[PDB]
Amino acid sequence: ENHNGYFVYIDASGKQVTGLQNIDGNLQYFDDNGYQVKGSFRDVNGKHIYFDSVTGKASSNVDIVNGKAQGYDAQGNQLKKSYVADSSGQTYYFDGNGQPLIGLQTIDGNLQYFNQQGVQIKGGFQDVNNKRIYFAPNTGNAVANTEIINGKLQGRDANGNQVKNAFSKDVAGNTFYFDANGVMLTGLQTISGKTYYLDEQGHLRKNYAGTFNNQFMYFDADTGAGKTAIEYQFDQGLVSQSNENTPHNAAKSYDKSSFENVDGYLTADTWYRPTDILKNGDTWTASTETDMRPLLMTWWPDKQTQANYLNFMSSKGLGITTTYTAATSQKTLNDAAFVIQTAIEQQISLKKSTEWLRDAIDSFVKTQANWNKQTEDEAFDGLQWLQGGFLAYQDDSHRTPNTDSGNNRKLGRQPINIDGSKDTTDGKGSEFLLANDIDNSNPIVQAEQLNWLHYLMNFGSITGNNDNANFDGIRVDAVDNVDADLLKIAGDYFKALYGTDKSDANANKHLSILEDWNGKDPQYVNQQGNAQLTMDYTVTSQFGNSLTHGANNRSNMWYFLDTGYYLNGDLNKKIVDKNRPNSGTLVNRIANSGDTKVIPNYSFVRAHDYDAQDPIRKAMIDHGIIKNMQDTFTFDQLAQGMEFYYKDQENPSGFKKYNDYNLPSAYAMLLTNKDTVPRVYYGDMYLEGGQYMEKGTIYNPVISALLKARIKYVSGGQTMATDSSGKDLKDGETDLLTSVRFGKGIMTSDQTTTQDNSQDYKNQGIGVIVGNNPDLKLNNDKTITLHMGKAHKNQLYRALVLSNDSGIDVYDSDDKAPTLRTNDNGDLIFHKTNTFVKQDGTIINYEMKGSLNALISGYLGVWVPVGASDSQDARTVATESSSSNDGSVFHSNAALDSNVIYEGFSNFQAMPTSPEQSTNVVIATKANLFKELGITSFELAPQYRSSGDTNYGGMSFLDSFLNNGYAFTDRYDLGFNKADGNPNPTKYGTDQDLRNAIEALHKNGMQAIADWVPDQIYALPGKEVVTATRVDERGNQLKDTDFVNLLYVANTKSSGVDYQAKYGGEFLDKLREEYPSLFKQNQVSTGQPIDASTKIKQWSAKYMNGTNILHRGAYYVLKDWATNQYFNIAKTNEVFLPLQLQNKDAQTGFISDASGVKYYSISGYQAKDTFIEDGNGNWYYFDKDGYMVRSQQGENPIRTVETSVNTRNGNYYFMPNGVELRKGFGTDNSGNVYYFDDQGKMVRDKYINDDANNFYHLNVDGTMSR
Amino acid sequence: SYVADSSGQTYYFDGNGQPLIGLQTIDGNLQYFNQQGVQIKGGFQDVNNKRIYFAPNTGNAVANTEIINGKLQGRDANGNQVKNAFSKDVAGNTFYFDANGVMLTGLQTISGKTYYLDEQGHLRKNYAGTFNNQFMYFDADTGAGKT
């Protein structure tokens, strides 16, 4: 609290705090009056403690104590032998006695200067002694620097002496040379028999190629010394590898028998069958089919990998421990590989096992960048945040034909982009979300999704011959991440089977909702005839801004009205604005009399996936239970975190760190709004963790009352107003929102009676008053009014719910509540101070007062008419007549509004401790309870068997390890028993438990909603080889990635023996016979109808768009660098292997001939049309003819390269010895300078910066303007 | 231990001799390391949702301000944007940022105390001026106006 400009702290006790206090982990102080101290020193006990100027938090400073400076730490101890920075960012060093050092000093091996007051000189020169020394900006350490004396640059070394006949730096990082006279040199200079190039400024240029002595000259990256680049830098001549061991280690066979493989290809951890085995390191013996050995014992992709293998295996006791490099001779490495092979066979005999080796190879393989995620470009922006990035599979019939999709895989066909017309913009859908993304643009897959849909809508019929245990409707998960055809497919299915387009009674018997977050989805859904209900994020959003989020600065309640709906916000005139910038809330409620058609919708305050998952994890992070949001956690870890979350939720202080504010007030509005189907979140009713329905939340009573009141009173028209005109509040204004419903046939304030002369209205209707300001106090004059309407003149009303300083009181019946009577015009008038009387006769006192406690931060009052019958029902039944010929399914009206959906699960529930406490068992016993709260549809969690802790590569997701059912391997397994007969429940119970749960809900007149999850599937056990490109969520290639059309081992193939195999495609034939039009109707995104001619009993890559990155590497599938062809052994007519393995002679190295230089890879093949790196790290390009590209005298060294590997296409600068220039400037034959990047490519049309803070500009044609 | 290489770049090697990567706390200091294990110094960095500035020589996490669109914004040491509060920049200037995140200017009364911010938005301390038409000295400690 703030009093007279000062912070005071008032305890949980209610006591004002003085003295030193650690409050919530921060050390602070308050003087005798209780005010807090900031930017000052205080003395407590033996400590001299400074407190910060912003926060008032204890930290280090320097005080002038008496006449002298003395340093202090956070705890208030005098510091000795240390450095302290003071309030103004100045630095002292205090010695062994606590006294600050002055003058020149050597501290921790560093030279530093201190002024006469003990302050450290930083970022300037300083005349200590005869010499002048520069001291660095942040360290303050002595360093070489240059300054301008007269008009000429001069150099100063670290000792403060001027530099003569030598090179010296400046702080920025530029090197200069200064001659005998001290003067900086320029241009081309030969000193100590070596030649350096200094630019016009005098900067020494390193890694710079230029024609300097009329003959090319490359200036060293190390020292800038000019070499002629005539000497070849490759150190490996052409050598033969074959020897006495070659025929023994060669493969027994060139096929799947002798080679571990995937779709014919080989992998880094492949093992093969050699012809013979050096058993025990003694005697070569023919191999038996079980004698498999690792390919890396005998072959390597390149010398670097070979050297790394030798060093790694050496470290494990297998030979002389070695430092080998790619520069080591090939002959040496091969000899060393054999002594390791010997040692290996000895440890195989000694251990009588090869498992130890499997683990050694696996370990070694993950060490190498090409075989781990370092070549996968892990990224976390956008949806990549979930799992680290995506790979899009490609159609490549030449290399990977099993994986070809038949020209499907249209990505990002979300509703707004169903036809691809926004593919080039951000309007393209984020097709990739999680795990293996199913290709819902493929007609065959579309048919399979319909089969699954049929299976769910007839679950009970099919699995228990129980026609009462069937789901009634669906929730469509992740609409914006799949092909929008699925909506039409689902819509048309329900039309065909249930005649949902015939009547509101048919439609409303199968309530179906969409998870459709895009702000333009509502209008799409409505153009397509509302086959499923859109969400209304606009109201959920406004709850966030005005009530639910944040302790203080909240949007005004005014924003709920959306007055812009009317021209000039003319609430007097009420002219609807026919043309607006596509904005505002979906349904206006200022004066909604049901006269204008509106888009039917569901709405909510929270969800299993909204305002839950993030807070619950932030809480775990905040208490050090995990480090990252993507971090894997155990259920025990979750339970501990949950305890902090609950503690925060129920905090009597009223402050909430992770949880949402004002949930009751939010539900009061959600549950009284016209033209919406409200949805209630299990986790606002019961605690989100632990056991299902284990313990109610503090909000439960209030929400329960609102729910029951909704059945009795909520009908008719609506109005909504605020004591507020905009962002800013005038003097009297409270910003208190007043929402009213009138009764069954009453549509307006001024309507006094129904047209049909029904009397139902008189005891119906409701009044809601809500505020978002806990510190709200009314002026004494101020009156606040609820216009209950002219159909309710002089009527007695009683409170349902009233907020106060300790909680919110809930009144169950007319007798126990305060009454108040409306006037002749039908208004309930409220003042700052009120005296209400019970109908009994008792008098009650009540202030219109903002309150702050666990249940509210603001005001909440709800009022209902007294005299309500016990069985009073204000709901409207849906009519069987064909009311509309518009073609649409759902219509927003009184009937639809009479529904309430309950989202009845939480992602963070604990696993059942016993079968009796399984969610679906509990639902069956408690069905009664939900009927009486007015739930007409029960949204059950997804019932599919969780993929669990299974993880074939890449990052696991919480859906999977929390077993919530959104992550599954088998789409048709909803809790079936193991094949041995044992029970095998999901998190929610067996399949019988589910059928019982569904039946129980029908016995209590409620529907059951199936969560339809078509976007992805997790943890498929079978491997295939795909052609993959690294992409972002929309399937766009990452800008700077080498990972393009590469072969990759993915987990895409289903077991083939699961419930997907049993029930896959089975119901389609029966359906085509009975409803032919479903199978003949064309879909929009494809132009085709769904295709039931092919059944999906087993998933595989051809039906997938892609996957999250699996951490295997860009080149885990083995390839020859020289030809760029991948090794394969599937068909004996098209085998490609390294020549060693076929007992042929593999020659490897560089060899010159009259025409030029050639290169042979470790596998014995000639490099053509490919880049090659030598053992010293230099790069070369070999042209289509097989010859190294090299610059000639008088010719342009810049060459344009078009390779088989497209990503490398570009302009390169090859020197006379063929070395590609990288990360440096290169001069062409005509004097123009270009720059070439990390990978050798020319850079165009941008500014480029230097480590020394030099800037250069490169024109569009590549040249450097600088 | 820390080691700086030939080019003046810095790594930290752990108990096994392997360099640390990503966000780390060392000697009680928060620091970031790129995918190659190199230490980020003198720049912003999007680690998680938050954006954090790391100091030029220490590389330690600190509050800083950057210009987003055409308006100065404030970033704290944890990488969260600053709203309704004072925040520094690396140079040493203090600013105040309102509920909307926007830096304030001129004479401002917040939490019943009065501060003077110049045209650039710098909080002025140890500054004497006739501000409310009556003399006012702005504190050397916190910049709060006394009479």
Ligand SMILES: OC[C@H]1O[C@H](OC[C@H]2O[C@H](O[C@@H]3[C@@H](O)[C@@H](OC[C@H]4O[C@H](O[C@@H]5[C@@H](O)[C@@H](OC[C@H]6O[C@H](O)[C@H](O)[C@@H](O)[C@@H]6O)O[C@H](CO)[C@H]5O)[C@H](O)[C@@H](O)[C@@H]4O)O[C@H](CO)[C@H]3O)[C@H](O)[C@@H](O)[C@@H]2O)[C@H](O)[C@@H](O)[C@@H]1O
């Ligand atoms: O223009 C001067 C008037 O400004 C205020 O009036 C705002 C309007 O209020 C009523 O309609 C609103 C309707 O706009 C919408 O508001 C949602 C949301 O708005 C604010 O949050 C925004 C946030 O969405 C985001 O905006 C980004 C930009 O989006 C578009 O490009 C906009 O055109 C642009 O202006 C936005 O900047 O980020 C913004 C910055 O952080 C943020 O401002 C507001 O803070 C939230 O509380 C609010 O939920 O839906 C509301 C219902 O939910 C409607 O009530 C009026 O009908 C409309 O005419 C107004 O223009 C101000 O109050 C008026 O007094 C000014 O005259």
Ligand SMILES: OC[C@H]1O[C@H](O[C@@H]2[C@@H](O)[C@@H](OC[C@H]3O[C@H](O)[C@H](O)[C@@H](O)[C@@H]3O)O[C@H](CO)[C@H]2O)[C@H](O)[C@@H](O)[C@@H]1O
């Ligand atoms: O931090 C505890 C440690 O501090 C001293 O060690 C310093 C070390 O911190 C470093 O100083 C560089 C630089 O850092 C601060 O920002 C300071 O303001 C600035 O003046 C300082 O120059 O480098 C030196 C070199 O070894 C170290 O000595 C203490 O000496 C040590 O005993 C403390 O434990």
